[PDB]
Amino acid sequence: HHWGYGKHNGPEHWHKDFPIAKGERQSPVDIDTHTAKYDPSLKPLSVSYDQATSLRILNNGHAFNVEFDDSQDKAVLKGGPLDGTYRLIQFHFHWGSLDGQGSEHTVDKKKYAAELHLVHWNTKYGDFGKAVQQPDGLAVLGIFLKVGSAKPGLQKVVDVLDSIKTKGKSADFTNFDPRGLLPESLDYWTYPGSLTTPPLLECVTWIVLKEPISVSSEQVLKFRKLNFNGEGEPEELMVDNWRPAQPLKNRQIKASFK
């Protein structure tokens, strides 16, 4: 596939190779804070990252992924809307060319500067490849980024980006603690949706935190120096790697909080 975020290969083209792009539970969506309803049936959200084992950072030509050892139950997400145990396998971000855009989800049509996706797969399906074939296969924890004060726990990510500037470059990224990327509050919205990149599989329980994290202008400027292209190819800055809001269709967004 040759999908990306340009005029010629961007989100409006994706449906030709990935017809589910026009499906019934696509992501991201706008979160209308007034029509999202408090659900008392939601159990407490459990983010258990104490034993998280990061291994590597990869520039995959669409974003950069911090990859985890998911060979055991070391870093898991449970509770909230979730049945059973979801294992952390990677995180990445989507971000803008300028501070006024970059998030995939929106909140009353507001766009944040960036959005962090912590990707977990349901352990009842045994591996990630099997889990993406199921409607409850994945849980993605989405966290908004606004530009303000630096996020101390982000800086180790920022400082390695120089070593993975281009598509296909990776670097060792051991002993990174993803708990440093969380906000104080775990208040969330949740809805059923999809991967936000091809293959756009309708396999995700979305859990979007209400409280954004603050990152510095200097931190997000370093995200924007990455390249979509490979080494020795024409430089295309890795910016505006976000899919816009998709139709909500027959879905309800539920709030964990009143």
E strand spans, 45-113: 45-48, 54-59, 64-68, 76-79, 86-95, 106-107
Binding-site entries for substrate: 196-197
Q: Does 197 bind ligand M8S (CB under 6 A)?
A: yes
Helix (H, G, I), strand (E, B) or coil at 131: helix
Q: Which of residues 141, 181, 195, 207 is near ligand M8S by CB under 6 A?
A: 195
Longest dimension (CA), the chain: 54
Q: Does 117 bind ligand M8S (CB under 6 A)?
A: yes
Q: How far apart are CA 77 and CA 92, in angstroms?
A: 16
Q: Applying CB under 5 A, which residues contact Zn ion? A: 117
Q: Which does 245 bind (CB under 5 to 8 A by kind): ligand M8S, Zn ion, none?
A: none
Rg of the chain over Cα atoms, rounded to whole angstroms, equals: 17
Task: Please give the size of the binding site for ligand M8S, defined by CB under 6 A.
Answer: 13
Q: How far apart are CA 214 and CA 101, in angstroms?
A: 15
Residue 54 or 258: the one with the smaller Cβ distance to Zn ion is: 54
Shortest reach from residue 63's CB to ligand M8S, in Å = 8
Residue 39 or 56: the one with the smaller Cβ distance to Zn ion is: 56
Binding-site entries for Zn(2+): 92, 94, 117
Peptide bond preceding 199 in cis form (omega within 30 of 0): yes
Q: Which does 42 bind (CB under 5 to 8 A by kind): Zn ion, ligand M8S, none?
A: none
Binding mask 26-65 for ligand M8S (x = CB under 6 A): ----------------------------------x----x
C-alpha distance from residue 184 to each of 54, 171, 187 (Å):
22, 30, 9
115 with 105: CB under 8 angstroms?
yes
Which residues on adjacent β-strands are paired with residue 141? 118, 207
Q: Which of residues 74, 79, 128, 244 is near ligand M8S by CB under 6 A?
A: 128
213 with 143: CB under 8 angstroms?
yes
Q: Which parts of 63-82 interact with ligand M8S (CB under 6 A)? A: 65, 67
Annotation says 120 is catalytic: no
Binding-site entries: 92, 94, 117, 196-197
What are the residue numbers of the active site? 62
- State the residues that interact with ligand M8S by CB under 6 A: 60, 65, 67, 89-90, 117, 119, 128, 140, 195-197, 204
